[PDB]
């Protein structure tokens, strides 16, 4: 097997090419910009409707409605401005580890330990939420499935595979197979043409929703990447791992720009999201509290400590007006 | 204020009442977790009861509703979803006693028990350890000595000794012999007493949970 000799030299060539493009560091460039100061964000809402531990959430493009999944078999659709429950969709399998909100708002989705993330119809006659489709075909727990549009949806399962679906058809039109560990997160680019995804091999990748080929491959973590989130510009993305370290990567330089680590932080990250502008890096940890990293100088700005258990999900509204955190405490805070 | 939002608040309160009502129905149920290494008798204990990622199995015995989650159909990293089954009432564990001479699979089952017994989530969760295929263990214990999987066996190669040796080798894997229990039962196809044994262990676990709730324990 002399073909593996090409792989080693190829990896060295990749590491050398990006090393030559590493002129300066993001710390040196942003060493001449004023910091963001202490960012004190207090709780505005508390959404108390779940009985088990909340495992996921996702805002709507209206930045007012948010879905949330939990292990008690319910998928509630909150109204954040008034804490009202707009729907409460009972799931056929209470082991749900992800949920999504269609950009238009006519559908939601949720999957888990049943290898299926099923699309629910919100805007329909008969005034009840009804399962539109049940997208089966994965061979492992579904960790994240996000909506491209009302008719397509990308998933990412525990069988080291991400797949692009067609809701009206129900068949994987494109399957992305390049990972060696199981995929644990996912995030769509603003233009919804590329997307990155964590894994359990400390390697996030970059795919194309139309071609299906792995564009680039980023590494540098020491443990399983738990979360991921695209920079609002679409040319960078942060990650979250079990080594208690977030790091902003870069699709242009093909390498990480900086790393957000603290000495008194030892628990893994479960959730990562940016802000509307892109200066804040909201990261939810197993320490029961969500930290706030200034995403340009890598200094901890503030702390969002209001949960009584591990924070498992995190989302920032599409207008940046609020930050919703959901913990195993069964409560879903909304900061501002 | 609240012109048409009064009816929205009323609908929210109605589905909140429905959530509270559906959460009490799922609290009076006993959730188990059927683990076990491959090729174990775990597919037969589901049939000993009343009975594609995980397959729930709902059944009722003596006015007690059991839910048994068989998670063997997921050949992925257990580290990344084993926290979903936290707070489960008990952990059933099927171990084939007739696999001590097949392939060192008994040591695989032993290390699996050590991993899902000293797990950071199942510290207080009791374990109902079953030992299936007792008849095949009977038939294969007289000719195949225990020295294959346990060469340090100092004793007679009879059933009442070697079976108890396996029982104490499995029971000597929890470093929390004060907080958690391990109910062992040399099950078989005899008289279907497995449901009664699971009911007894689950009743003890429920008594302990009630004691923790009322502040006594």
């Amino acid at each position, epitope marked *: 097997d002399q073909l593996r000799q090409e792989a080693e030299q190829l990896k060295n060539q990749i590491r050398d090419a990006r090393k030559a493009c590493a002129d300066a560091t993001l710390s040196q460039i942003t060493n001449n910009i004023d910091p963001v100061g202490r960012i004190q964000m207090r709780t505005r809402r508390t959404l108390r409707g779940h009985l088990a531990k909340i495992y996921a959430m996702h805002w709507g493009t209206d930045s007012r409605l948010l879905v949330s999944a939990s292990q008690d078999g319910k998928l509630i659709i909150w109204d954040s401005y*008034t804490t*009202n429950k707009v729907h409460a969709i009972p799931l056929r399998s209470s082991w749900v580890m992800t949920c999504a909100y269609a950009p238009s708002g006519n559908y939601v989705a949720c999957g888990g330990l049943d290898n299926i993330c099923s699309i629910y119809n919100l805007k329909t006659r008969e*005034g*009840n939420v009804r399962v539109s489709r049940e997208l089966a075909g994965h061979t492992g727990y579904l960790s994240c499935c996000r909506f491209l549009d009302d008719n397509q949806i990308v998933t990412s399962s525990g069988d080291t595979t991400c797949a692009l679906w067609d809701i009206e058809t129900g068949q994987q039109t494109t399957t992305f197979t390049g990972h060696t560990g199981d995929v644990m997160s996912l995030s769509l680019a603003p233009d919804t043409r590329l997307f990155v995804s964590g894994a359990c091999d400390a390697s996030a990748k970059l795919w194309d929703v139309r071609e299906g080929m792995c564009r680039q491959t980023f590494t540098g973590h020491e443990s399983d990447i738990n979360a991921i989130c695209f920079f609002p510009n679409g040319n960078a993305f942060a990650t979250g791992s079990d080594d208690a370290t977030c790091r902003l990567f870069d699709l242009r330089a093909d390498q990480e720009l900086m790393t957000y680590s603290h000495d008194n932080i030892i628990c893994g990250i479960t959730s990562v999201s940016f802000s509307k502008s892109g200066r804040l890096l909201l990261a939810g940890y197993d320490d029961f509290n969500c930290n706030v990293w200034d995403a340009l100088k890598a200094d901890r700005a503030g702390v969002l400590a209001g949960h009584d258990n591990r924070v498992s999900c995190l989302g920032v509204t599409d207008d940046g007006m609020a930050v919703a955190t959901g913990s195993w405490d069964s409560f879903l805070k909304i900061w501002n | 204020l609240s012109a048409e939002d009064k009816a929205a608040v009323e609908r929210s309160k109605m589905i909140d009442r429905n959530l509270r009502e559906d959460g009490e129905k799922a609290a009076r149920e006993v959730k188990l977790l059927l683990l076990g290494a491959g090729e174990s008798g775990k597919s037969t204990i589901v049939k000993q009861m009343k009975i594609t990622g995980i397959v729930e199995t709902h059944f009722t015995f003596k006015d007690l509703h059991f839910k048994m989650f068989d998670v063997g159909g997921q050949r992925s990293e257990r580290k990344k979803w084993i926290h979903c089954f936290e707070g489960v009432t008990a952990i059933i564990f099927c171990v084939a006693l007739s696999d001590y001479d097949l392939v060192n699979r008994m040591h695989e089952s032993m290390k699996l028990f050590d991993s899902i017994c000293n797990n950071k989530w199942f510290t207080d969760t009791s374990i109902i350890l079953f030992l299936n295929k007792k008849d095949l263990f009977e038939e294969k214990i007289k000719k195949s000595p225990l020295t294959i999987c346990y060469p340090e066996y100092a004793g007679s190669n009879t059933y009442e000794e070697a079976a108890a040796y396996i029982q104490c080798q499995f029971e000597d894997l929890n470093k929390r012999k004060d907080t958690k229990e391990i109910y062992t039962h040399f099950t078989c196809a005899t008289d279907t007493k497995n449901v009664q044994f699971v009911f007894d262990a689950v009743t003890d676990v429920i008594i302990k949970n009630n004691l923790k709730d009322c502040g006594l324990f």
Partner: single-chain antibody
Amino acid sequence: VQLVESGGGLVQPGGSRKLSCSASGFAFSSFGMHWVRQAPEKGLEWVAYISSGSGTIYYADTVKGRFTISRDDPKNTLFLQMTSLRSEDTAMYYCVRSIYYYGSSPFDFWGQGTTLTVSSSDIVMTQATSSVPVTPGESVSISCRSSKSLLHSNGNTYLYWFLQRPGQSPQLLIYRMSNLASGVPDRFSGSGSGTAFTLTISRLEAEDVGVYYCMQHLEYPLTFGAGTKLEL
């Protein structure tokens, strides 16, 4: 979706009669139901309303005490037990459906209606032009002025627009003054602000003949308008 009523006929004044609206085709238990009557040659008029779970009931100022309303969720039936009828209650009684959450379209589906005949502080909507002529292809502009600013503090200006074609029941066109109803062509478009509303129709087509009522849903009792009729 279906809403059929039954219990119509001639009734002597002072008597009693029960109207039953039997729903079939939707989750009746989750919709708040209304009763809306219409005199033989007058506009619509609100009567009663039950919420989901019967936890809230309202009546008008003419049927309070006389009429009582009730729902049977397991049987999917809506009742209006009428007592002490008068010579003014002669009207077709419509069974209306209405669900209330963020982004809902209440008053979406209207029933067919009975033909009950009895032998012998509110908000006032005003539709000035009670009847105007119109030719296909032309643009119409119906107006409806309220006696109180409907624009609420949360931004939602509650004003609904209905269309009752000749021979049918009124269907929903616009809800909350801006939102088109499902299954309604994009020709219709509501505009206006508080106390001054308008329903502009562009590139008019056939089957648009009928009466156009403007209901306010700011507070009970809900009030309709006189109704502008379009003549060919």
